[PDB]
Amino acid sequence: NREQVFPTRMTLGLMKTKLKGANQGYSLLKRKSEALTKRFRDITKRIDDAKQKMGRVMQTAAFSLAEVSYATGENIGYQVQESVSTARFKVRARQENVSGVYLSQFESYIDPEINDFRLTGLGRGGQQVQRAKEIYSRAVETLVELASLQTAFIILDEVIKVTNRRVNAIEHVIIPRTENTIAYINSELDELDREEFYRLKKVQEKKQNETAKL
Amino acid sequence: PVTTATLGITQVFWGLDKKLAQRKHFPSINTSVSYSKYTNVLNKFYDSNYPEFPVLRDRMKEILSNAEELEQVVQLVGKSALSDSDKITLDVATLIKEDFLQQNGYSTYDAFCPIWKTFDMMRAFISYHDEAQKAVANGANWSKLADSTGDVKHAVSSSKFFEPSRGEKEVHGEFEKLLSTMQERFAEST
Amino acid sequence: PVTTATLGITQVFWGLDKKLAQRKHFPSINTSVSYSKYTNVLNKFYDSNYPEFPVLRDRMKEILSNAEELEQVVQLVGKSALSDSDKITLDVATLIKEDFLQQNGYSTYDAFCPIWKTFDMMRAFISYHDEAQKAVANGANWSKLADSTGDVKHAVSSSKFFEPSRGEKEVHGEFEKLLSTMQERFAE
Amino acid sequence: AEKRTLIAVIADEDTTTGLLLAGIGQITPETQEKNFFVYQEGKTTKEEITDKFNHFTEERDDIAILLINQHIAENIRARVDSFTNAFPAILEIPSKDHPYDPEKDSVLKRV
């Protein structure tokens, strides 16, 4: 339960510096864990709210799609699958700096290269198809935001777990370990000083005996 | 000073750790600091009688060292990131410490483990580690492999109970069946 | 006891570190502990000869101390989301330690670094640090800035390879180009 | 990562059609792979759905966010639980006549 360090004054000073640095790191990492835990609680609340909003938006989009299909008189799923050569909607990751973590944030984008939808050739209900497409695009943006929030929450959970494990390790392992090493080094140098004192006392006894004889 | 002078003058150092002295892990030999300088000269006897003894001893020593490093890193950073090979090494070295290295000198089976029994049990443990490594490298998940081969692990760990009073022929006969069964139970599982 | 008595009696202390010595980081001066009590007296000579020398020396001492604190914090907390200015100070101090406080006393070019050459090198390092600080404070990302100014950083590194045997006129002019090149990167 | 720029949809037919209308999913001509694959309970099988989800999560590196219906995710609950990696993200969107279940959500389970 002590570091394998040779008892010396330089070693003692190095271990005192190590203990001070370990205490400072313990305090700093505990505060960082507290900040990330507050951010993670906020992220969990936002994730629950976004899940509820995404459920509502999904219900609305399903209703709009059903209305569009009823207006068109047939399922536009086959036509949409056929006209799936390129994706107009793309998401680009952004390395946002939330607290001390570097959680990536998804940023949606629209490509106008294949922005044309399957409205042409649908038979009827072009306005309904366009409205359903707009509603689905809004729902897709909301889902992208929710996915970014969930990814940030997962990354923050992993970072907070790692940080809390680091704080617990630092304290429970290092601080007893470094404190025991400091105690052992102090004891060893005390023993060396005591041995030197005894040798000097023996020298004084011999000198006093010689002086008394002379 | 006495210990330092004795280490300077002697050739074999069987260090004892009080952590293993407690928790009834006798012999409480510290495998990290202990050393023997007669391993080089003993190669003649080993090649004459038990040729695989030095190779098996070296393999067990390196397994113990790897597991010491793994335990050191895990004790501060957890075991949620270890590889399958690292898990195999940790499990096999814990098995070695619990069954092979520890010897109950006051029990009839483990009062006296002769050289042939020790060599055969080293062969058993090293073959277990090698079979586990090969099976996992083939693609088998270590958790499922351990669940399937718990019987083989128990048979290996209980090999110390083989009384040497039966003789070299009887004990070695059981050990040869132990390796053959263990090899089969690692091929059927995989 | 001899070290303590000499430390109490003398005015300057060029403490050496075994860790720096073994890494061949000679002269291996322990900057944290080393001190000189003659700077107050030498302000007069510096104002006479090289007026900006005391300010540059104080700036480099402050940079080294701040970077030592930041390096301790980095060792503590894994350098997670370090500030741009903090990374600038760390990089500048690493460059200073590896190209200004490390000189081979047996190499031909760095056996003797005269006062004028070391003052020019100090000014070059401080100007590089100030340019990086100002450019990042303007909004530039430190990673892209380092990628663009690697040439200037290598020039400042080779300033240690500049030979003092060319005389003051040649060496001072060479550093004049380095300041011009460093100022050029500021515009970009 | 910046390479992952797509949205994966493994939900029901109506939800797949809605996603296609939104334009998030598409079929790559050169790669001969579709980002949004239509799959229902009757269509294919649970093993096929799990294999498709695994391919979207790992083989389809371009996919950034995965949209799986709650009914589809119910049969792929083991795969969803095993998919502990943050990238790509997994969302349990509700299907037709199948409201979203907070208990069935894998992300909410970690809370």
Side-chain angles (χ1 to χ4, degrees), chain A residues 26-30 32-33 35-37 40 50 55 61-62 66 71 73 77 87 93 100 112 121:
Chain A
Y26 167 72
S27 87
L28 294 174
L29 275 162
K30 185 183 286 185
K32 173 175 178 239
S33 179
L36 259 59
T37 300
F40 178 67

XYZ file of all heavy atoms in Angstrom, chain A residues 26-121, unseen atoms left out:
509
model
N -7.845 15.706 -7.737
C -9.068 15.169 -7.151
C -10.146 16.240 -7.072
O -11.284 16.026 -7.508
C -8.753 14.601 -5.767
C -9.951 14.286 -4.905
C -10.770 13.204 -5.187
C -10.247 15.058 -3.792
C -11.859 12.909 -4.394
C -11.334 14.771 -2.994
C -12.136 13.695 -3.299
O -13.220 13.404 -2.505
N -9.796 17.415 -6.545
C -10.779 18.491 -6.429
C -11.248 18.964 -7.801
O -12.453 19.140 -8.034
C -10.190 19.654 -5.631
O -9.489 20.545 -6.478
N -10.308 19.165 -8.730
C -10.672 19.657 -10.055
C -11.548 18.659 -10.800
O -12.526 19.047 -11.448
C -9.416 19.973 -10.867
C -8.545 21.125 -10.366
C -7.272 21.225 -11.188
C -9.315 22.432 -10.401
N -11.220 17.369 -10.718
C -12.008 16.369 -11.420
C -13.363 16.157 -10.762
O -14.340 15.879 -11.459
C -11.237 15.053 -11.502
C -10.254 14.942 -12.666
C -9.251 13.838 -12.409
C -10.993 14.700 -13.967
N -13.457 16.299 -9.437
C -14.771 16.241 -8.805
C -15.644 17.410 -9.246
O -16.840 17.236 -9.511
C -14.636 16.216 -7.285
C -15.966 16.027 -6.575
C -15.814 16.071 -5.070
C -15.166 14.803 -4.555
N -15.114 14.774 -3.067
N -15.065 18.608 -9.337
C -15.840 19.753 -9.808
C -16.238 19.591 -11.273
O -17.360 19.945 -11.662
C -15.048 21.041 -9.602
N -15.333 19.062 -12.100
C -15.669 18.792 -13.494
C -16.775 17.753 -13.599
O -17.669 17.868 -14.445
C -14.426 18.329 -14.254
C -14.699 17.869 -15.676
C -13.409 17.545 -16.409
C -13.681 17.027 -17.810
N -13.129 15.661 -18.013
N -16.727 16.725 -12.750
C -17.783 15.722 -12.726
C -19.112 16.336 -12.318
O -20.156 15.986 -12.872
C -17.405 14.585 -11.781
O -18.436 13.617 -11.720
N -19.099 17.246 -11.343
C -20.334 17.918 -10.948
C -20.900 18.755 -12.090
O -22.112 18.735 -12.349
C -20.088 18.787 -9.715
N -20.037 19.499 -12.787
C -20.500 20.309 -13.912
C -21.065 19.433 -15.024
O -22.140 19.714 -15.573
C -19.359 21.180 -14.438
N -20.356 18.354 -15.362
C -20.838 17.446 -16.395
C -22.098 16.716 -15.957
O -22.922 16.363 -16.799
C -19.749 16.444 -16.774
C -18.984 16.741 -18.064
C -18.295 18.091 -17.984
C -17.981 15.639 -18.355
N -22.279 16.499 -14.653
C -23.501 15.866 -14.172
C -24.687 16.814 -14.283
O -25.795 16.393 -14.634
C -23.317 15.399 -12.729
O -22.242 14.453 -12.668
C -24.587 14.743 -12.210
N -24.475 18.098 -13.989
C -25.529 19.079 -14.230
C -25.882 19.144 -15.712
O -27.065 19.150 -16.084
C -25.097 20.453 -13.719
N -24.862 19.168 -16.575
C -25.111 19.182 -18.013
C -25.822 17.912 -18.462
O -26.677 17.953 -19.350
C -23.796 19.360 -18.772
N -25.494 16.774 -17.847
C -26.115 15.509 -18.220
C -27.564 15.441 -17.760
O -28.413 14.881 -18.459
C -25.311 14.346 -17.640
C -25.901 12.998 -17.927
C -25.951 12.511 -19.220
C -26.401 12.215 -16.900
C -26.493 11.269 -19.486
C -26.943 10.973 -17.159
C -26.989 10.499 -18.453
N -27.868 15.992 -16.584
C -29.260 16.078 -16.155
C -30.063 16.974 -17.089
O -31.196 16.641 -17.468
C -29.337 16.590 -14.716
N -29.485 18.114 -17.481
C -30.153 18.975 -18.451
C -30.352 18.253 -19.778
O -31.406 18.381 -20.414
C -29.351 20.261 -18.653
N -29.353 17.479 -20.206
C -29.450 16.746 -21.462
C -30.514 15.660 -21.370
O -31.219 15.389 -22.343
C -28.079 16.163 -21.849
N -30.639 15.013 -20.212
C -31.677 14.001 -20.034
C -33.068 14.622 -20.089
O -33.979 14.068 -20.720
C -31.474 13.263 -18.711
N -33.252 15.771 -19.433
C -34.540 16.455 -19.511
C -34.851 16.876 -20.942
O -35.981 16.702 -21.424
C -34.549 17.666 -18.578
N -33.853 17.418 -21.644
C -34.049 17.815 -23.033
C -34.337 16.608 -23.915
O -35.115 16.702 -24.866
C -32.822 18.572 -23.542
N -33.723 15.464 -23.611
C -33.955 14.253 -24.390
C -35.377 13.752 -24.187
O -36.031 13.313 -25.136
C -32.917 13.177 -24.027
N -35.875 13.797 -22.949
C -37.264 13.410 -22.708
C -38.229 14.342 -23.435
O -39.189 13.886 -24.078
C -37.552 13.399 -21.207
N -37.983 15.654 -23.355
C -38.843 16.607 -24.050
C -38.793 16.397 -25.559
O -39.827 16.451 -26.237
C -38.439 18.037 -23.691
N -37.598 16.150 -26.099
C -37.449 15.911 -27.527
C -38.103 14.605 -27.949
O -38.633 14.520 -29.056
C -35.969 15.911 -27.910
N -38.072 13.581 -27.095
C -38.768 12.338 -27.409
C -40.273 12.555 -27.476
O -40.938 12.050 -28.388
C -38.421 11.268 -26.374
N -40.827 13.311 -26.523
C -42.256 13.615 -26.578
C -42.602 14.419 -27.829
O -43.587 14.121 -28.523
C -42.681 14.369 -25.318
N -41.794 15.437 -28.137
C -42.041 16.253 -29.321
C -41.912 15.429 -30.596
O -42.681 15.616 -31.544
C -41.078 17.440 -29.350
N -40.940 14.515 -30.639
C -40.756 13.664 -31.806
C -41.918 12.697 -31.971
O -42.331 12.412 -33.096
C -39.434 12.903 -31.697
N -42.454 12.178 -30.866
C -43.643 11.346 -30.965
C -44.832 12.109 -31.516
O -45.554 11.620 -32.394
N -45.044 13.330 -31.017
C -46.137 14.152 -31.533
C -45.940 14.472 -33.012
O -46.887 14.401 -33.807
C -46.257 15.437 -30.714
N -44.710 14.819 -33.400
C -44.427 15.158 -34.790
C -44.577 13.934 -35.682
O -45.021 14.041 -36.829
C -43.024 15.778 -34.911
N -44.202 12.756 -35.181
C -44.380 11.528 -35.946
C -45.855 11.221 -36.152
O -46.258 10.797 -37.240
C -43.679 10.365 -35.243
N -46.676 11.424 -35.119
C -48.117 11.239 -35.281
C -48.677 12.207 -36.318
O -49.471 11.821 -37.188
C -48.823 11.416 -33.937
N -48.261 13.476 -36.247
C -48.734 14.465 -37.212
C -48.294 14.115 -38.629
O -49.077 14.238 -39.579
C -48.232 15.857 -36.826
N -47.043 13.678 -38.791
C -46.538 13.318 -40.110
C -47.239 12.080 -40.653
O -47.500 11.990 -41.855
C -45.027 13.098 -40.052
N -47.543 11.112 -39.784
C -48.296 9.942 -40.220
C -49.693 10.333 -40.685
O -50.176 9.834 -41.708
C -48.372 8.915 -39.090
N -50.353 11.231 -39.949
C -51.668 11.701 -40.375
C -51.588 12.429 -41.712
O -52.431 12.221 -42.596
C -52.273 12.610 -39.303
N -50.575 13.282 -41.882
C -50.413 14.007 -43.140
C -50.139 13.054 -44.297
O -50.675 13.232 -45.397
C -49.289 15.034 -43.012
N -49.300 12.040 -44.072
C -49.007 11.065 -45.115
C -50.244 10.256 -45.478
O -50.476 9.964 -46.656
C -47.873 10.143 -44.668
N -51.049 9.879 -44.480
C -52.291 9.170 -44.764
C -53.242 10.036 -45.581
O -53.872 9.555 -46.531
C -52.953 8.723 -43.462
N -53.353 11.319 -45.227
C -54.207 12.224 -45.993
C -53.708 12.375 -47.427
O -54.506 12.381 -48.372
C -54.279 13.586 -45.303
N -52.391 12.497 -47.606
C -51.825 12.641 -48.944
C -52.072 11.383 -49.767
O -52.408 11.457 -50.956
C -50.324 12.975 -48.859
N -51.894 10.209 -49.156
C -52.143 8.958 -49.864
C -53.611 8.824 -50.249
O -53.932 8.372 -51.355
C -51.702 7.772 -49.006
N -54.518 9.210 -49.348
C -55.941 9.167 -49.668
C -56.278 10.117 -50.810
O -57.071 9.778 -51.697
C -56.769 9.502 -48.428
N -55.689 11.316 -50.803
C -55.936 12.268 -51.881
C -55.401 11.752 -53.211
O -56.053 11.901 -54.252
C -55.312 13.621 -51.539
N -54.213 11.143 -53.200
C -53.619 10.640 -54.432
C -54.292 9.366 -54.926
O -54.194 9.051 -56.117
C -52.124 10.389 -54.236
N -54.968 8.630 -54.047
C -55.638 7.406 -54.429
C -54.760 6.176 -54.475
O -55.267 5.087 -54.772
N -53.466 6.307 -54.192
C -52.558 5.169 -54.214
C -51.357 5.485 -53.336
O -51.103 6.642 -52.991
C -52.113 4.831 -55.641
N -50.622 4.436 -52.979
C -49.429 4.583 -52.154
C -48.289 5.137 -53.002
O -47.990 4.603 -54.076
C -49.041 3.242 -51.534
N -47.656 6.204 -52.520
C -46.560 6.843 -53.240
C -45.235 6.251 -52.778
O -44.162 6.745 -53.142
C -46.580 8.370 -53.043
N -45.304 5.193 -51.967
C -44.086 4.578 -51.466
C -43.229 3.982 -52.566
O -42.004 4.135 -52.564
N -43.859 3.292 -53.521
C -43.107 2.705 -54.626
C -42.444 3.779 -55.477
O -41.280 3.641 -55.872
C -44.029 1.834 -55.481
N -43.169 4.862 -55.771
C -42.593 5.950 -56.555
C -41.443 6.616 -55.810
O -40.419 6.960 -56.412
C -43.673 6.973 -56.905
N -41.598 6.813 -54.499
C -40.532 7.416 -53.703
C -39.299 6.521 -53.696
O -38.165 7.001 -53.819
C -41.030 7.707 -52.276
N -39.499 5.210 -53.545
C -38.376 4.279 -53.574
C -37.690 4.284 -54.934
O -36.460 4.205 -55.019
C -38.850 2.871 -53.216
N -38.474 4.363 -56.013
C -37.889 4.437 -57.348
C -37.073 5.712 -57.523
O -35.985 5.686 -58.110
C -38.988 4.351 -58.407
N -37.581 6.836 -57.023
C -36.882 8.119 -57.125
C -36.039 8.371 -55.874
O -36.199 9.361 -55.160
C -37.882 9.246 -57.361
N -35.121 7.440 -55.618
C -34.243 7.517 -54.455
C -32.790 7.496 -54.913
O -31.919 6.963 -54.216
C -34.525 6.373 -53.465
N -32.524 8.066 -56.090
C -31.169 8.050 -56.634
C -30.193 8.790 -55.728
O -29.075 8.316 -55.489
C -31.161 8.656 -58.038
N -30.592 9.951 -55.213
C -29.745 10.737 -54.330
C -30.588 11.301 -53.195
O -31.802 11.473 -53.322
C -29.038 11.874 -55.081
N -29.924 11.589 -52.078
C -30.581 12.094 -50.881
C -30.430 13.608 -50.822
O -29.307 14.125 -50.828
C -29.997 11.448 -49.625
N -31.561 14.314 -50.767
C -31.530 15.769 -50.675
C -31.151 16.247 -49.279
O -30.607 17.347 -49.133
C -32.886 16.350 -51.077
N -31.427 15.449 -48.252
C -31.158 15.823 -46.870
C -29.892 15.129 -46.385
O -29.764 13.906 -46.499
C -32.338 15.460 -45.969
N -28.962 15.915 -45.844
C -27.716 15.393 -45.304
C -27.447 16.042 -43.955
O -27.894 17.161 -43.688
C -26.537 15.642 -46.254
N -26.713 15.328 -43.105
C -26.382 15.793 -41.764
C -24.867 15.820 -41.622
O -24.195 14.823 -41.906
C -27.010 14.899 -40.676
N -24.335 16.957 -41.182
C -22.905 17.136 -40.980
C -22.626 17.291 -39.493
O -23.248 18.124 -38.825
C -22.385 18.355 -41.749
N -21.696 16.491 -38.980
C -21.363 16.544 -37.564
C -20.569 17.804 -37.242
O -19.711 18.233 -38.018
C -20.569 15.303 -37.159
N -20.862 18.396 -36.088
C -20.163 19.577 -35.601
C -19.609 19.285 -34.214
O -20.337 18.799 -33.341
C -21.091 20.793 -35.559
N -18.326 19.584 -34.013
C -17.649 19.293 -32.749
C -17.887 20.449 -31.782
O -17.024 21.297 -31.541
C -16.164 19.046 -32.981
N -19.092 20.477 -31.219
C -19.432 21.491 -30.232
C -18.720 21.208 -28.915
O -18.539 20.052 -28.522
C -20.944 21.538 -30.015
N -18.314 22.274 -28.230
C -17.597 22.169 -26.960
C -18.577 22.490 -25.835
O -18.740 23.644 -25.436
C -16.389 23.098 -26.940
N -19.232 21.454 -25.321
C -20.164 21.582 -24.207
C -19.410 21.208 -22.939
O -19.022 20.049 -22.755
C -21.404 20.701 -24.402
N -19.210 22.189 -22.066
C -18.434 22.031 -20.822
C -17.035 21.546 -21.217
O -16.463 22.045 -22.198
C -19.180 21.135 -19.855
N -16.458 20.591 -20.489
C -15.155 20.060 -20.835
C -15.155 18.957 -21.866
O -14.084 18.552 -22.327
N -16.328 18.453 -22.238
C -16.407 17.382 -23.221
C -16.439 17.968 -24.629
O -16.665 19.164 -24.834
C -17.630 16.484 -22.962
N -16.206 17.103 -25.615
C -16.220 17.508 -27.015
C -17.299 16.751 -27.777
O -17.041 16.208 -28.856
C -14.850 17.275 -27.656
N -18.505 16.699 -27.214
C -19.602 15.967 -27.837
C -19.923 16.536 -29.212
O -20.058 17.751 -29.381
C -20.840 16.018 -26.942
N -20.046 15.649 -30.195
C -20.371 16.071 -31.550
C -21.862 16.354 -31.678
O -22.699 15.637 -31.122
C -19.953 14.999 -32.555
N -22.194 17.410 -32.416
C -23.574 17.817 -32.640
C -23.901 17.692 -34.120
O -23.189 18.241 -34.966
C -23.810 19.252 -32.162
N -24.977 16.971 -34.427
C -25.384 16.783 -35.813
C -26.047 18.048 -36.345
O -26.909 18.636 -35.685
C -26.336 15.595 -35.928
N -25.643 18.465 -37.544
C -26.195 19.644 -38.203
C -26.757 19.217 -39.552
O -26.001 18.838 -40.454
C -25.132 20.731 -38.368
N -28.078 19.280 -39.689
C -28.736 18.875 -40.922
C -28.503 19.902 -42.024
O -28.248 21.081 -41.765
C -30.236 18.689 -40.694
N -28.592 19.435 -43.269
C -28.422 20.295 -44.430
C -29.289 19.768 -45.563
O -29.679 18.598 -45.580
C -26.953 20.373 -44.865
N -29.585 20.649 -46.513
C -30.435 20.329 -47.656
C -29.607 20.482 -48.923
O -29.015 21.542 -49.164
C -31.684 21.223 -47.702
N -29.565 19.424 -49.733
C -28.851 19.450 -51.001
C -29.829 19.760 -52.121
O -30.792 19.001 -52.314
C -28.161 18.115 -51.257
N -29.635 20.841 -52.878
C -30.599 21.174 -53.935
C -30.333 20.424 -55.231
O -31.046 20.614 -56.222
C -30.413 22.686 -54.113
N -29.303 19.575 -55.236
C -28.998 18.790 -56.429
C -30.118 17.806 -56.746
O -30.498 17.643 -57.911
C -27.671 18.055 -56.248
N -30.657 17.143 -55.724
C -31.728 16.170 -55.907
C -32.937 16.590 -55.084
O -33.694 15.743 -54.594
C -31.267 14.752 -55.527
N -33.124 17.902 -54.922
C -34.227 18.412 -54.115
C -35.591 18.096 -54.716
O -36.602 18.208 -54.014
C -34.084 19.922 -53.923
N -35.645 17.718 -55.992
C -36.915 17.368 -56.614
C -37.515 16.139 -55.943
O -36.827 15.138 -55.718
C -36.718 17.113 -58.109
N -38.804 16.218 -55.626
C -39.504 15.133 -54.959
C -40.234 14.276 -55.994
O -40.063 14.442 -57.205
C -40.459 15.691 -53.905
N -41.063 13.344 -55.520
C -41.840 12.467 -56.386
C -43.238 13.006 -56.665
O -44.165 12.221 -56.908
C -41.920 11.066 -55.778
N -43.416 14.329 -56.625
C -44.726 14.910 -56.904
C -45.162 14.631 -58.337
O -46.333 14.324 -58.589
C -44.701 16.414 -56.632
N -44.236 14.737 -59.287
C -44.557 14.445 -60.677
C -44.828 12.957 -60.859
O -44.130 12.108 -60.297
C -43.414 14.886 -61.592
N -45.852 12.644 -61.650
C -46.231 11.266 -61.880
C -47.043 10.631 -60.776
O -47.295 9.422 -60.833
